Every structure is written in structure tokens, then in C-alpha cells.
Design a protein around this ligand. Structure first.
Ligand SMILES: [K+]
Ligand SMILES: [K+]
Ligand SMILES: [K+]
Ligand SMILES: [K+]
Ligand SMILES: [K+]
Ligand SMILES: [K+]
Ligand SMILES: [K+]
Ligand SMILES: [K+]
Ligand SMILES: [K+]
Ligand SMILES: [K+]
Ligand SMILES: [Mg+2]
Ligand SMILES: [Mg+2]
Ligand SMILES: [Mg+2]
Ligand SMILES: [Mg+2]
Ligand SMILES: [Mg+2]
Ligand SMILES: [Mg+2]
Ligand SMILES: [Mg+2]
Ligand SMILES: [Mg+2]
Ligand SMILES: [Mg+2]
Ligand SMILES: [Mg+2]
Ligand SMILES: [Mg+2]
Ligand SMILES: [Mg+2]
Ligand SMILES: [Mg+2]
Ligand SMILES: [Mg+2]
Ligand SMILES: [Mg+2]
Ligand SMILES: [Mg+2]
Ligand SMILES: [Mg+2]
Ligand SMILES: [Mg+2]
Ligand SMILES: [Mg+2]
Ligand SMILES: [Mg+2]
Ligand SMILES: [Mg+2]
Ligand SMILES: [Mg+2]
Ligand SMILES: [Mg+2]
Ligand SMILES: [Mg+2]
Ligand SMILES: [Mg+2]
Ligand SMILES: [Mg+2]
Ligand SMILES: [Mg+2]
Ligand SMILES: [Mg+2]
Ligand SMILES: [Mg+2]
Ligand SMILES: [Mg+2]
Ligand SMILES: [Mg+2]
Ligand SMILES: [Mg+2]
Ligand SMILES: [Mg+2]
Ligand SMILES: [Mg+2]
Ligand SMILES: [Mg+2]
Ligand SMILES: [Mg+2]
Ligand SMILES: [Mg+2]
Ligand SMILES: [Mg+2]
Ligand SMILES: [Mg+2]
Ligand SMILES: [Mg+2]
Ligand SMILES: [Mg+2]
Lengths: 58, 135, 85
RNA sequence: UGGUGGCGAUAGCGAAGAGGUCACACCCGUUCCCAUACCGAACACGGAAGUUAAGCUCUUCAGCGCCGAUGGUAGUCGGGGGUUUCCCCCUGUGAGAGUAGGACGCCGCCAA
RNA sequence: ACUGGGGCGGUCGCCUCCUAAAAGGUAACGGAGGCGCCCAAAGGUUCCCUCAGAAUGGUUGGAAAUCAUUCGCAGAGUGUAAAGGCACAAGGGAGCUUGACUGCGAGACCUACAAGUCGAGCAGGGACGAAAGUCGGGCUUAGUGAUCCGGUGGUUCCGCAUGGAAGGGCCAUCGCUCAACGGAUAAAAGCUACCCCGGGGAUAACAGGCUUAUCUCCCCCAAGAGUCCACAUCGACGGGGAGGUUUGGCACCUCGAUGUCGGCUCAUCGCAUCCUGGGGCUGUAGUCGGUCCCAAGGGUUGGGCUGUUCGCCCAUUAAAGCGGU
RNA sequence: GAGUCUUGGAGGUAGAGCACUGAUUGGACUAGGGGCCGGUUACCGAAUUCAGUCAAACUCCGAAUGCCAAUGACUUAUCCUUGGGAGUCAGACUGCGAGUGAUAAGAUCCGUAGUCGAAAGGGAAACAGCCCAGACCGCCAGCUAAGGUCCCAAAGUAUACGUUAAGUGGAAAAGGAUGUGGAGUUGCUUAGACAACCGGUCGAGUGACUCUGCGCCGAAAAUGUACCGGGGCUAAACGUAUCACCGAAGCUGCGGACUGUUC
RNA sequence: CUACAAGUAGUCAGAGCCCGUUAACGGGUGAUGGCGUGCCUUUUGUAGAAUGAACCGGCGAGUUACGAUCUCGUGCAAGGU
């Protein structure tokens, strides 16, 4: 169980708390993708910035 | 002209007028009534105009309830002063009216007469209103 | 350009804020002496191993873990329990 | 039963009953210790003629108080929109009131 | 000094509440109040206790004095403002006392610093209590002021060759409405249109901008007035707008200069039309008018008074428009 | 150190409520007072009671969030101390929560997030602060964002079903109206309605009410059309849905430079 | 190259004409098309209808001494000078 998480929207103009969450997923650049283990921790991060990211389930 | 006999504080925050009316959304004493569709301050001067308009058309027959009371004071500064140097002096009294509030109720006249009495009163008020019945 | 005279306010005073309230979290480890709660009166009561100072400050009398807990129906206390040793 | 605890009145009020050999009371005295801003009322010391009337103990009850969901609604974090004193939409969250309901005590230890 | 320009008025430190957006913090010349103490018990401790108010009865005695009963989460009290607390009381009473102690102090809170706050516990010597124990002022949070300088008391400290002394140090303590309360000096008010320099469009006066309370104009409802009749005409109580010519609000351009009222000269634009053109309604017989609609083509006087704009007046005129630039 | 999940906690806002304080409406009810004879009344009335409103400085209640922690987990790379060196102490607007103001101001003053400041690129005609998005250089490559696709002007004169007739779109309110679309309730009607025409004659509907979509009037300012950027548009407008495409200095591709880390 | 054009004067695109170099995917000119409000100072914000400079040239502003302190370097080191 793994998630491809892609940053679709810029973090420019977004609250710091959302920016931090995005960066903590390892997303440093628009359209970057990162892979993480599907769990409640990551799902919650995604929930907090769902408007900024896109999620494929591997 | 309605105003409170005394008040705890003569100068109050204006506050805000979000949300529907907490209470008084049904005709409760009368048979008929006029309901607010919009929020506004209603001054005691507007309540007296509305009261008279409906009462005259009923010929002082029947019975009118005034469900709003203008308890909230409002201040104004004197004409032409600069900003600051303390809050302005008490000027008048308002009732805060949110959508859904039944403002007046009427009993002891026909529905035709009630409708007309309340129509006349509506034109004195700064809000849109709907005629309502009890259930 | 004319300028209307203006009055004055008789208000404009307030005391320094006193930084009251909780100073340690429920479940946090404290050392003896640590102020747990600053208050006027007993909004919160001293529980186990907790003291009430002259100005109603609640403080830990031992080292241990802070527990805020319901004290009967209406009231609250704060206690400090020793660590498992 | 009596003592002594713990538990948010689900323990409480109120109402109607039942009980006393022992135990707990009321009760009967003021010599003594002790006592009352006056009073043996109380506190204190002593007693056992009387009595369950009251306290106390045990039943029953939902009038008051208490506890109390589910659903809905208000509000609201985040994201959008608009006709922007304010309003609407979407993924979450979610009261207060109201109500279904619970409830006229539950759990120790000691002594007899 | 602050200051919705400055002056003038008000304020300046501390405490409590609200604003303050359910930690803490949080501004305004925002909304409300207090303080510059008091108490030798109104402090400590031991023991005992329960308040407001009401009803009913009762000499003087009433609405209300003291007495009695009943009901009575407090509707009282808590030295004092408020808030938070407080009825196993932090409220009330009584006995004995002086812990309203000396040396301190793990550790915390608060905090730019300076300060400010809480503190178990240890030692000394006590108060109350049979004991357990409580006590380093008061239910809590205001009741205060740095340093320098000086005074007073104490002192196993220093003492300019030595002994003293003078004088200093240390500990205790006193002297500030230094209240502009982090206190410039021990010691301090005005005028400048005779003014000057450095700066500022950080900040006022003109004009512009935003706003539109005020102002001008237009509306809605229709109570009344109009013999009758709301709507010819007028339109109260109330309600909704437009305009941006008024007085202002704000302080955004301009203070290394945006000349500032009126008039003169020259206009040009808007239309909410003064006249002339065309109309509807009329409480329009006619002649006159009233009111509303269309219409901006052209027109729209000369004098007296006043710096005047304006206004009043004289005499005319078809008319003697209102505004913008 | 930080993010997120989980768990615990402090706290009284939004909401709500009336248990307290204060305000307040109607009914029942009268103590008492006032007119009127110790006697009576449409005159007011405390308490009590039933029902009903409201509150920054009310609370029997009470969130969402935010905050403080603990606990591992998944992720991320910060964090602390000491020392050297600064600059800053005029902020602006936007959104949201308040005050002041008139619930005016491109106003003022806080709180909170963003952007500008100190940020170029695309969009919003032009336009610090709005929407999209962060420019190390080069390329006559590609994919997208906001915003768009008739012509100016790159890309749909796209598809489907509706709406609007006002150039609404492309500035405005109370209020006024047989505008028009969609729902729904209902009176009456071949025992002949409604209209017309001497209660009777004549042949199918006719009249209210509610809700809602889109329009209409209300709507007058000064150099010149003069809130669509223009042309022009009856869709090239609006709503819903779908798919293509255009579109940035975003991202990718290819080449080059430098910094950092790891090896 | 230029007499139908609306210009912070360039820039990128680009024919035509004229040349021929430190020989380079060259040089001059520039019809026409796209984009584009100087520089500086001071500001919340300046194309600014704020400030400064006519142009060109020259000259024209964190220095030195003595102390202090920190980093780095070197010598020696419980010593150093
Ligand atoms: K001002
Ligand atoms: K005492
Ligand atoms: K001062
Ligand atoms: K001028
Ligand atoms: K109008
Ligand atoms: K000036
Ligand atoms: K803001
Ligand atoms: K149009
Ligand atoms: K060009
Ligand atoms: K100038
Ligand atoms: Mg003026
Ligand atoms: Mg004290
Ligand atoms: Mg509930
Ligand atoms: Mg000054
Ligand atoms: Mg002033
Ligand atoms: Mg003065
Ligand atoms: Mg908060
Ligand atoms: Mg707070
Ligand atoms: Mg001195
Ligand atoms: Mg000597
Ligand atoms: Mg000072
Ligand atoms: Mg000073
Ligand atoms: Mg003179
Ligand atoms: Mg002279
Ligand atoms: Mg000068
Ligand atoms: Mg300015
Ligand atoms: Mg001005
Ligand atoms: Mg100007
Ligand atoms: Mg300003
Ligand atoms: Mg100049
Ligand atoms: Mg006209
Ligand atoms: Mg509220
Ligand atoms: Mg600010
Ligand atoms: Mg501003
Ligand atoms: Mg700057
Ligand atoms: Mg930045
Ligand atoms: Mg930019
Ligand atoms: Mg552009
Ligand atoms: Mg700039
Ligand atoms: Mg094209
Ligand atoms: Mg239009
Ligand atoms: Mg494409
Ligand atoms: Mg590109
Ligand atoms: Mg890039
Ligand atoms: Mg590369
Ligand atoms: Mg031509
Ligand atoms: Mg030519
Ligand atoms: Mg041009
Ligand atoms: Mg400026
Ligand atoms: Mg200058
Ligand atoms: Mg010059």
C-alpha cells in the first residue's frame, strides 16, 4: 500500500501551516511527485492539503 | 415612543446581525402577523409609525402585539466633529431584527383587514416582510 | 477651515494583564515547585501532592506527572502523581 | 442493625406506608468533670421509667429536581462562489434546546 | 509629551472588568469603575456556628428596632472597585496569642532590562492545639517610586608612619503628589506680525481624491388638508435612492512653492428648463395660471448699496435659469 | 525542531439559553396608589403566576478551531547554546474576526492569513497589495495554471439541453407591473362556466393564491461615444453538462554555469 | 533609410539594399510586426504632475593614531612578553 502524492497547486499564497505540511511530504516544487506508505499519518497530511495535491494509489 | 425605563450601559457595541431570528418566528398571540425577510435595526420611531398605520386601518378594533422592543441604544457624534475623543452620546433606540422574526401580530379582525393593515405598516419599515398566519 | 471643539473621555485605564491560567499540561512531567495554575480564587483546587499558595497559585509538592481531573459534580482539581519507579 | 469510607442528586426533595429484644435514637436527671454573651436547649457527665412520635432503618411512587441518547438543526475548521451590514455551495466536525429513555442507590471494610 | 495638524480641553503610575476572536498576549483621546490605604484585630491558632428575605404571632413599636416559629443554595456576608472565588466556608462567634517571626530556600511563573510573583523544604526560637497539625499578615489580585545624596541605630570591617580619631564600608531603617509616577537639574514662565535656520506633503490651511453624515434633487407608503374627494394641488408619521455645486470627515498627490476671494476678458459643457417650441392632467369657462412630460437650438438686461459671492432695492425684460470646468 | 495521526488536558468564544443579573411583551391576577363616595371605577400598578422576547461588560449550557502536552508510528530537517557582524522600530492593501466612525471612507485601531514591501512572468484593457505563479543562463521543443478560443488576438463561429429580447449581458434601492420560463395549491366549468350579448340566450375553458428562474420600470451631471478594452455580438449573453484546444520566466525536455550535501 | 506618421526611442522578429571581418551559425542600414512609462534619491506606494543632474571632462566621501574586544595566523606555553 503506497501513495503517489503530486503537488498540483503552488504553495504561494497559501497559509504557512499548509506550506509546512506540503514540504514535510517532501514536495518542494510544483508538479513534483513523492511516494509514501498509505497510513493514517500520511492520509491526514493529505487531508490537510487535499486542495493542493493529487493522490494516485499504487 | 418605546424605550427601556433604565439600562445597564448607555453606550453599547453595534454588534452584528448574522443568522435567523433566535425566537419569535411564529405568530404566537395573534392570528396574523408580519415576518421579517431581511435583517435590520428597527428604530422606535419606525415601530410607532408602523403601529399607527396598522392601528388606524383597524379603526382601533381588534388587538396589536408589538413583538420587537427597541432596547439597544445607539450613539451619534455631534455634526462636523473629528474622529476620536471618546464615543458619541446616546441618540436613539433600536430593535435588532433578523430574518424570520415576526414583528407585529394582529387579532380580532378579518384576514382581509389584517392583510391590509399589515401591508400599510410594512411600508413604514426598512425591511422586506411577508404576511404570516398562526398554525 | 473651521474645526468643531471636542470633548474628552473619562475612561482609558486598564491594569497589566496577569498571565493567569495553566502553566503545565495534563500528562506533563514536572519538578517539585513547578507552578501548575495561576488564578484568583479556586477555579481549580489542589489535588494530590499539590499546594495552594497565598495568591491561590497551585504548585507541585513533588516531582511527577500532572493530572487535571474532575472534582465531584461542579469542581476541578489538579494532582501530581509520582512516576512508576 | 450499628460504625466508618468511596463513587458527579441515577445518591436529592416531596409523598404514602412498615419497623425496634439487641443495636441507634428520642427519653429521664444535674451530685461530679465540663457548659450557656441568659437558658443542662446545646455541649458535658450520669441514668434506664417510657416511646417508636421524630431522627435512623426498610418498602412503594416519576409531582419537583437530577442523569440522558439517536436523528435533525444552529454554529464552525478547510476549500470554493455571490446579489458582500450579509448570504450560498462542498469534504469534515457538531451543539444548546427538545425528546426517547434512565433513575426513589451503587460499591467496600469493621463490629454485633 | 501624547494628540486623527497644532493650540486649547483631557490624559500620564498602579488595580479590576469588557472590548479580547473559549491558552497566554493584543490597539484606539474605545466602554465602565477603583487606588496612593485600612485593621493591634479586620492578624495567628483552637473550638463552635450559618446567612438575605418573607409569612404568621407579639407591650410600647411604625413599612422597618428587639422576641418566637416556619419556609429559606445563598436571593447574604466577605474592611474597600471589580472579577474570580468561598456555606467539609474564605461568611459569623468565643478563648488563648503576636508567625504582621530571624536565617533561608529545591524548583517554578512572569519578563528586553530593572523589577514583580509563587514555593515545598531545612535550621533557630516561638503561638495555638490533647494530638494531627497550622502559622513567614489579611478570600485572592491595587494601597506605590530606581540611583545619587543625607539622617538615625547596630557593627569580630577599613583607618594614608604608628595609636587613636575624622571619615568611609557593611547590616537595619528614615527623608520624594521626584503623580510628566524608569525619576533630564538642587534650582526655571511667556511673546515674536521684526523674526531666522534645518527639515516634512511623515502634518494643517487652497484645489484635487475617497466618503456622503450634512447639502441639493428625486422617489415609496398614504394619515390628513383640499365642501365631497389621499393622489387638481399639497402631503404628516415613517421608508428608499441619485447627485457630488455646501459644511464637513479622512490625510492619498503637491511644503527643493499645485498663487489664494471677488471682479474683468474669453468662453465651453451638463440639464435637475428661466424664456421661446410641443404636450398630458387640472379644483382648465375665457384671459391668466398650477402641476407633470418632451425639449439644451438660440436666448437669458442696465443700475443703487456692499471687496463682496450672495442678498435687498430701482427700472426693465419673452426671460432676467441652476450648476460644472 | 517541525508536520500528521492517536490520546489526555486547560479555557467559556460562535451558537444557544433564561438557572442568576439587567432589559422587556401579552394574558390571568391583585397588594397598593390615582379619579369617583369606611365606599366605587376600562386609570396606573408591585409581587405571584402562565406564556413570550433580548444582552460586549447575563450564563443552567456550550462547539468548530486554536493552545499545552504525552505516546509511538509514518514523514521531514530542523532546533538549541556561545561568540563576531548587522539592519529594522513611517508599513500598504486584500480576505476573515472585532472596536472607533454613520455596521461612511482608498478612514482609523487591534487580531488573524496572504501578497506587496524586497517579486520579474501569465491573467484582471491600463492597474505595488486581487487571481495564477516564484526569473542561475541558452533553445525557432513539449505539457499545463489562472484566464480564455468571431475579428483586433493564440485557441471551439465546439457539442447537448434550457433561459433572456432587456444590447439585459456590459454599474444602483424602496417600491411598481396581465413581461416571460418552471413548479405547486385551489375556486368554478358540457347539470354548460369566464367574456360578450336580455337572472335567460352562446360552446371550451376561466379566475385566484404560493414558491421559484431570467428580464422590465424606478435610473439626472457637467471636454467626447465613454463600466463590454475596441470592433461588433441575439450569441460572440446566461444556466447546466461534456470534451478538445490555446495559454506563464510554473513543470518537462536538451545543453551550459555555479552552490550545497552525500559518496 | 526617411514627406499617411502617434515614437522613454530600445529590444526581439524581419525583407530589401550596401559591404566584406580578430572568419565568425559576419558587418552597416532598416520597410514592416510584437513588446516596452529614463536613471537616481526618497517612499506604504514614484513613469511620476515628488527630488537631483544642460552636456562632456577632471576633482570629489568609513581614514589614520592610540586604546579595547573577537575571529584567523604564527612563536613560545603554565607560562608569555
Ligand atoms: K484628520
Ligand atoms: K481569634
Ligand atoms: K517622563
Ligand atoms: K485651485
Ligand atoms: K428618484
Ligand atoms: K505646499
Ligand atoms: K487585516
Ligand atoms: K450593453
Ligand atoms: K519596434
Ligand atoms: K515640488
Ligand atoms: Mg475651506
Ligand atoms: Mg497576602
Ligand atoms: Mg443534546
Ligand atoms: Mg507635541
Ligand atoms: Mg487635535
Ligand atoms: Mg493643557
Ligand atoms: Mg483565542
Ligand atoms: Mg485569552
Ligand atoms: Mg545624580
Ligand atoms: Mg593613621
Ligand atoms: Mg515615564
Ligand atoms: Mg525622563
Ligand atoms: Mg504692527
Ligand atoms: Mg513694530
Ligand atoms: Mg525655512
Ligand atoms: Mg500625505
Ligand atoms: Mg481639502
Ligand atoms: Mg492637484
Ligand atoms: Mg494613515
Ligand atoms: Mg520643483
Ligand atoms: Mg429633462
Ligand atoms: Mg451570541
Ligand atoms: Mg499594522
Ligand atoms: Mg488605510
Ligand atoms: Mg522601504
Ligand atoms: Mg517572501
Ligand atoms: Mg509581482
Ligand atoms: Mg498586460
Ligand atoms: Mg516599484
Ligand atoms: Mg485566432
Ligand atoms: Mg449594460
Ligand atoms: Mg495543449
Ligand atoms: Mg513557455
Ligand atoms: Mg523555474
Ligand atoms: Mg540539467
Ligand atoms: Mg490615412
Ligand atoms: Mg511613406
Ligand atoms: Mg497611445
Ligand atoms: Mg507620502
Ligand atoms: Mg526633498
Ligand atoms: Mg533640475
Amino acid at each position: 500500500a503506497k501513495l503517489e502524492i503530486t503537488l498540483k497547486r503552488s504553495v504561494i499564497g497559501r497559509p504557512e501551516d499548509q506550506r509546512v505540511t506540503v514540504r514535510t511530504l517532501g514536495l518542494k516544487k510544483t508538479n513534483q511527485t513523492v511516494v509514501h506508505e498509505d497510513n493514517a499519518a500520511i492520509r491526514g497530511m493529505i487531508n490537510k492539503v487535499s486542495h493542493l495535491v493529487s493522490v494516485k494509489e499504487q | 415612543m418605546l424605550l427601556p425605563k433604565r439600562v445597564k450601559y448607555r453606550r453599547e457595541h453595534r454588534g452584528k446581525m448574522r443568522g435567523r431570528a433566535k425566537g419569535g418566528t411564529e405568530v404566537h398571540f395573534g392570528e396574523f402577523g408580519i415576518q421579517a425577510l431581511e435583517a435590520s435595526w428597527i428604530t422606535n420611531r419606525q415601530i410607532e409609525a408602523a403601529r399607527i398605520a396598522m392601528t388606524r386601518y383597524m379603526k382601533r378594533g381588534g388587538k396589536v402585539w408589538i413583538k420587537i422592543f427597541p432596547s439597544k441604544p445607539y450613539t451619534a457624534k455631534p455634526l462636523e466633529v473629528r474622529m476620536g475623543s471618546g464615543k458619541g452620546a446616546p441618540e436613539g433606540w433600536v430593535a435588532v431584527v433578523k430574518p424570520g422574526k415576526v414583528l407585529f401580530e394582529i387579532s380580532g379582525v378579518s384576514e382581509e383587514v389584517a392583510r391590509e393593515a399589515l401591508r400599510l405598516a410594512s411600508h413604514k419599515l426598512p425591511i422586506k416582510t411577508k404576511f404570516v398566519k398562526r398554525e | 477651515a473651521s474645526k468643531k471643539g471636542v470633548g474628552s473621555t473619562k475612561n482609558g485605564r486598564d491594569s497589566e494583564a496577569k498571565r493567569l491560567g495553566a502553566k503545565r499540561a495534563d500528562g506533563q512531567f514536572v519538578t517539585g515547585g513547578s507552578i501548575l495554575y495561576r488564578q484568583r480564587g479556586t477555579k481549580i483546587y489542589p489535588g494530590e501532592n499539590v499546594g495552594r499558595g497565598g495568591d491561590d497559585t497551585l504548585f507541585a509538592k513533588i516531582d511527577g506527572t500532572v493530572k487535571f481531573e474532575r472534582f465531584g459534580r461542579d469542581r476541578k482539581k489538579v494532582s501530581v502523581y509520582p512516576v512508576a519507579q
